[PDB]
Design a protein around this motif. Structure first.
Motif, short mmCIF file in Angstrom:
data_model
loop_
_atom_site.label_atom_id
_atom_site.label_comp_id
_atom_site.label_asym_id
_atom_site.label_seq_id
_atom_site.Cartn_x
_atom_site.Cartn_y
_atom_site.Cartn_z
N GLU A 62 0.82 -1.21 0.00
CA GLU A 62 0.00 0.00 0.00
C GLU A 62 0.85 1.26 0.00
O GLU A 62 1.70 1.43 0.87
N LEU A 63 0.60 2.13 -0.97
CA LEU A 63 1.28 3.42 -1.10
C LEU A 63 0.77 4.37 -0.02
O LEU A 63 -0.44 4.56 0.11
N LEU A 64 1.68 4.96 0.75
CA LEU A 64 1.33 5.90 1.81
C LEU A 64 1.46 7.35 1.34
O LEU A 64 2.29 7.63 0.47
N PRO A 65 0.67 8.26 1.94
CA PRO A 65 0.94 9.68 1.75
C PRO A 65 2.19 10.08 2.51
O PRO A 65 2.56 9.42 3.49
N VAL A 66 2.85 11.13 2.06
CA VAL A 66 3.99 11.70 2.76
C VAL A 66 3.55 12.95 3.52
O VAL A 66 2.75 13.75 3.02
N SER A 67 4.10 13.12 4.72
CA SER A 67 3.79 14.25 5.58
C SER A 67 5.01 14.61 6.43
O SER A 67 5.79 13.72 6.81
N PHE A 68 5.17 15.89 6.73
CA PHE A 68 6.15 16.34 7.71
C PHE A 68 5.51 16.71 9.06
O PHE A 68 6.19 17.20 9.97
N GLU A 69 4.21 16.47 9.19
CA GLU A 69 3.52 16.72 10.44
C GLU A 69 3.33 15.42 11.18
O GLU A 69 3.12 14.36 10.58
N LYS A 70 3.42 15.51 12.50
CA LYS A 70 3.16 14.39 13.38
C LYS A 70 1.74 13.91 13.12
O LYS A 70 0.80 14.70 13.12
N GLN A 71 1.59 12.61 12.83
CA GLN A 71 0.30 12.04 12.46
C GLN A 71 -0.61 11.95 13.66
O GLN A 71 -0.19 11.53 14.73
N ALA A 72 -1.86 12.36 13.48
CA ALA A 72 -2.89 12.26 14.51
C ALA A 72 -3.79 11.05 14.28
O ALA A 72 -4.29 10.46 15.24
N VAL A 73 -4.04 10.70 13.03
CA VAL A 73 -4.85 9.53 12.71
C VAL A 73 -4.07 8.68 11.72
O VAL A 73 -3.24 9.19 10.97
N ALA A 74 -4.34 7.38 11.72
CA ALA A 74 -3.57 6.45 10.91
C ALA A 74 -3.80 6.77 9.44
O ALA A 74 -4.95 6.96 9.02
N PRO A 75 -2.72 6.84 8.65
CA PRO A 75 -2.87 7.15 7.23
C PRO A 75 -3.57 6.01 6.47
O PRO A 75 -3.42 4.85 6.83
#
Length: 324
Positions: A194-207
């Motif tokens: 599964e391809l994930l989104p990229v983020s530089f923010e601390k995740q609050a909910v599971a991608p």
């Protein structure tokens, strides 16, 4: 808060600067991603713009695992299938390997990073099938990471391809993407298909991942990629003591530099560890090394090795085997 880990960022920075100085290179970048969330743990560039997200490259060998994955995922081939890997012609163009082998199995095609083998696997599929696969990995598509100047890269419509183009794409030329896009595409391998989104923010909910290949295929591809960092593989320079590491290394090409045309060779190394149960993806590029080696592996492998090793140490991951 940011997802970046200051200890990994600091390590990445020091190791990149050491390599750029030693090889008298023009520029460089390191990206470290959380292999199961897509969060950026580190992202550093030599001074200037955020090249990791703004600059696209023809990725070279780092793209090869994806054609292999597509081939295995289709059910059409198996890791033990053998191919003729002698150089061959497409019109006047030649497809050939760095070092020639008459035959390789799919494992060998990965281990030896064979352009010929990869191209023949790709050739089992139509242009549309390969284009759709590359598009699904994010090639030519915006990540919407939150960074300004983020390139989508380049993926020409299959409706315009030549046979040679499909071939060169399988071994990483003729399409373009940023180092961050490349690192992201590797989440298909690490996050069980599964391809994930990229983020530089601390995740609050599971991608939410987007399934590209079966989980079983991703696991097999990770197993195969360990051969690259072991004796007989092209990526032994990036082997990490105490861990099994899946990786690729190759010379990429930079054809655009900011808003201008360019032509530069770019040494690259990208991989994940621990291979069976990966925690991180580390990607390294160094533009135009001019000293103490031009071979991709010798230039970027040692930075990959130190950044990967250090990151696993920092994240508290125990070695899976005794150290040498």
């Amino acid at each position: 808060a940011l997802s970046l880990d200051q200890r990994i960022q600091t390590l990445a920075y020091e190791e990149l600067n050491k390599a750029v100085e030693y090889h008298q290179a023009k520029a460089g970048t390191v990206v470290v991603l959380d292999a199961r969330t897509g969060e950026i743990l580190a992202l550093v560039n030599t001074p200037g713009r955020n090249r990791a997200v703004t600059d696209m490259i023809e990725p070279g060998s780092a793209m090869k695992p994806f054609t292999i994955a597509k081939a295995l995922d289709s059910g059409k081939v198996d890791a033990t299938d053998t191919f003729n890997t002698l150089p061959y012609k497409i019109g006047s163009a030649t497809v050939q390997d760095t070092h020639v082998y008459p035959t390789l199995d799919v494992r060998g095609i990965m281990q030896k990073s064979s352009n010929v083998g990869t191209s023949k696997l790709s050739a089992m599929f139509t242009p549309k099938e390969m284009y759709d696969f590359y598009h699904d990995l994010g090639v030519g598509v915006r990540m919407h990471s939150g960074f300004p100047g983020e390139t989508a890269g380049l993926l020409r419509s299959w409706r315009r391809w030549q046979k040679i183009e499909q071939a060169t794409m399988s071994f990483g030329y003729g399409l373009q993407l940023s180092l961050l896009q490349l690192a992201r595409a590797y989440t298909v391998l690490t996050h069980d298909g599964e391809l994930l989104p990229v983020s530089f923010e601390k995740q609050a909910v599971a991608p939410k991942g987007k399934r590209v290949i079966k989980a079983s295929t991703a696991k097999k591809v990770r197993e195969l990629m360990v051969s690259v960092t072991e004796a007989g593989g092209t990526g032994t320079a990036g082997a990490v003591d105490g861990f099994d590491v899946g990786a690729k290394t190759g010379t990429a090409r930079k054809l655009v530099n900011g808003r201008y045309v360019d032509y530069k060779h770019v040494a690259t190394f990208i991989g994940f560890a621990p291979a069976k149960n990966p925690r991180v993806i580390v990607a390294v590029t160094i533009d135009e090394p001019t000293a103490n080696g031009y071979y991709s592996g010798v230039v970027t492998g040692p930075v990959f090795k130190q950044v990967m090793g250090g990151s696993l140490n920092i994240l508290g991951v125990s070695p899976t085997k005794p150290l040498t």
